[PDB]
Amino acid sequence: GLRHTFVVADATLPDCPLVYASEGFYAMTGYGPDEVLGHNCRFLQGEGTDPKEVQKIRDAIKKGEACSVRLLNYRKDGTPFWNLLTVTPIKTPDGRVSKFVGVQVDVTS
Ligand SMILES: *[C@@]12=NC3=[C]C([C])=C([C])[C]=C3N([C][C]([O])[C]([O])[C]([O])[C]OP([O])([O])=O)C1=NC(=O)[N]C2=O
Numbered sequence: 446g447l448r449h450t451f452v453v454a455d456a457t458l459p460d461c462p463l464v465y466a467s468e469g470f471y472a473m474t475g476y477g478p479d480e481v482l483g484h485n486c487r488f489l490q491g492e493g494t495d496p497k498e499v500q501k502i503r504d505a506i507k508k509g510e511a512c513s514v515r516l517l518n519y520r521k522d523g524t525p526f527w528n529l530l531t532v533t534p535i536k537t538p539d540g541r542v543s544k545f546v547g548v549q550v551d552v553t554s
Pocket residue numbers: 452453454461485486487489490499500502503506516518528530532545546547549
């Protein structure tokens with residue numbers, strides 16, 4: 446298949462911190478678990494990140510809906526790369542959102 450990464454966000458906490466990331470996620474971005482875990486994924490964002498696309502993710506999280514955007518992210522070394530992101534809400538049986546799962550694909554080609 447195509448190369449991709451994977452993270453899990455804990456919705457039971459208010460700002461959706463990351464609680465597990467795939468080895469590809471650390472290797473793609475250059476950040477380590479000690480600088481990724483516990484934090485919201487937005488640290489990957491930067492000057493060229495489109496605020497309208499960011500808005501689409503922020504609303505989907507509030508609304509508990511899946512979303513797919515294309516964002517300009519930045520590695521730890523500041524170099525940019527294009528990240529196609531799909532966020533999926535994971536619900537408990539009672540309809541409540543417990544976790545958000547994100548597949549990140551570098552589509553810089
Ligand atoms: C990020 N991946 C990512 C993965 C999950 C599971 C979730 C829930 C969010 C992301 N984001 C977005 C970020 O965490 C945040 O939700 C948005 O920026 C909108 O909220 P704010 O308050 O900051 O406007 C991801 N953002 C990225 O830029 N790159 C990803 O890989």
